[PDB]
């Protein structure tokens, strides 16, 4: 099963996506 490295990397990717969304929400 995915270890801490892979799971933490996925949380990092999720953080990038969520920040992506934050930016989109402000865009016009």
């Amino acid at each position: 099963s995915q270890g801490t490295f892979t799971s933490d990397y996925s949380k990092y990717l999720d953080s990038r996506r969520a920040q992506x969304f934050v930016q989109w929400l402000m865009n016009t």
Side-chain angles (χ1 to χ4, degrees):
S1 41
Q2 305 221 317
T4 177
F5 187 89
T6 300
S7 294
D8 281 0
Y9 184 69
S10 73
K11 288 171 109 171
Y12 168 56
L13 294 186
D14 291 342
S15 181
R16 289 176 55 79
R17 179 57 63 80
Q19 283 274 30
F21 183 43
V22 169
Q23 189 59 224
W24 180 85
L25 288 163
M26 290 182 284
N27 281 353
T28 57

